[PDB]
Amino acid sequence: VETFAFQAEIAQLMSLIINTFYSNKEIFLRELISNSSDALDKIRYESLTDPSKLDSGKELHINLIPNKQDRTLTIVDTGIGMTKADLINNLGTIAKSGTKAFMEALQAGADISMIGQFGVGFYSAYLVAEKVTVITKHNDDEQYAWESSAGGSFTVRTDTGEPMGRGTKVILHLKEDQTEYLEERRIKEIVKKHSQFIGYPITLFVE
Amino acid sequence: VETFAFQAEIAQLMSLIINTFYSNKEIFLRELISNSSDALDKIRYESLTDPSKLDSGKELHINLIPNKQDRTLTIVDTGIGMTKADLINNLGTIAKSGTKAFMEALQAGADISMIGQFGVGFYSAYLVAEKVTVITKHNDDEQYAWESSAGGSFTVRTDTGEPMGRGTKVILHLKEDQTEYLEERRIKEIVKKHSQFIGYPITLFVE
Ligand SMILES: CCN(CC)C(=O)c1ccc(O)c(OC)c1
Ligand SMILES: CCN(CC)C(=O)c1ccc(O)c(OC)c1
């Protein structure tokens, strides 16, 4: 298990997300679904000139898996996935510069819901989750598990768990007062409201 | 000079853009600026683990260059640029699937301004231009010039013109009745309206 420190600006972004009074929390799902869409676009583009890219899995889609027992909402995609380097480098984002722009925007009247426009939408997972676990598999690497409960550090380990084939799995360990996001009609409402133009199937699992 | 046929679905997207009565043409600039932002994000991300990626040019920005003599509006960025393969493969887009989703959306009430959400925003250049020339330079290839006046075909040639260092240059040969997009206050208005959260400098050249 390797423990790393977040870059200062990312710890601050996470602190802002966690600490700010801000009711419109539901947007975390749209931001995660959108990152999944972007990863799927990437593998699909690569497959256009190299069909073998899809050897690790031909279907391009997203599953939403609520689990009330464990209190987790899981967002799985079969997109391009991430290498160990992508994971350590702020999950494939340009987070330092994105955080800088987001902060300026907030100072000038933007609100937290606009986070995705600064390319750090992943971190909005902290609006609802106390701990976030990311399992990922890229064609060019082995499966890894990234994890953080914020607090300025994250871990990375080689994942021994069930093999994924290819893609990214975001496991949200939901805060005690955010269990509405495990409820079927609430998830369906949010998907329909914010993710109506996502070009891949989104399957909501039932329990 | 190599001449290629557009895939059928792209020729149809272009025909739709060109033929539909649709007044809100100004959005082409926001879509091009946004593609440039995405290319810049890409090179910046690569530079995070490999500083030499920026050997071909350290500054990450966008220039807007109107030229009333030639009737061209040029959008230059110093982003990641495109290889010959990217160019032939619909300028690095997943255009067939993106066109499919855009068409469905239009049929269900979307309008042309939402084109960028389907990842084929580049083609909105045809709302204002009769011919579009794209000059591009990727670290992994030499400089190329892609060109199309629609009509179902595009060309690709190795570019002999002034060397770019790295990035993408979109030269819009504007339609005779679209010269307002060469006017300073009109360009400035559009940038301010639609591109206020682009995290790179956008320099509007004067003539
Ligand atoms: C670098 C590839 N990538 C992003 C396009 C993913 O696999 C990915 C998918 C979903 C996410 O929520 C995510 O969080 C950042 C990353
Ligand atoms: C594949 C890299 N890329 C797109 C991210 C560009 O260089 C690029 C930049 C501006 C554009 O208008 C464009 O048109 C599609 C492409």
From Swiss-Prot, chains A, B:
GO terms for cellular component: apical plasma membrane; axonal growth cone; basolateral plasma membrane; brush border membrane; cell surface; cytoplasm; cytosol; dendritic growth cone. Keywords: Acetylation, ATP-binding, Cell membrane, Chaperone, Cytoplasm, Host-virus interaction, Hydrolase, Membrane, Mitochondrion, Nucleotide-binding, Nucleus, Phosphoprotein, S-nitrosylation, Stress response, Ubl conjugation. GO terms for molecular function: ATP binding; ATP hydrolysis activity; ATP-dependent protein folding chaperone; CTP binding; dATP binding; disordered domain specific binding; DNA polymerase binding; enzyme-substrate adaptor activity. ATP binds at residues 35, 77, 96, 122. It is found in: Nucleus; Cytoplasm; Melanosome; Cell membrane. Residues 1-207 are annotated as: Interaction with NR3C1. Transmembrane segments: none annotated. The TPR repeat-binding motif mediates interaction with TPR repeat-containing proteins like the co-chaperone STUB1. Belongs to the heat shock protein 90 family. Molecular chaperone that promotes the maturation, structural maintenance and proper regulation of specific target proteins involved for instance in cell cycle control and signal transduction. Undergoes a functional cycle that is linked to its ATPase activity which is essential for its chaperone activity. This cycle probably induces conformational changes in the client proteins, thereby causing their activation. Interacts dynamically with various co-chaperones that modulate its substrate recognition, ATPase cycle and chaperone function. (Microbial infection) Seems to interfere with N.meningitidis NadA-mediated invasion of human cells. Decreasing HSP90 levels increases adhesion and entry of E.coli expressing NadA into human Chang cells; increasing its levels leads to decreased adhesion and invasion. This is Heat shock protein HSP 90-alpha. The chain holds residues 17 to 223 of 732 of the full protein.
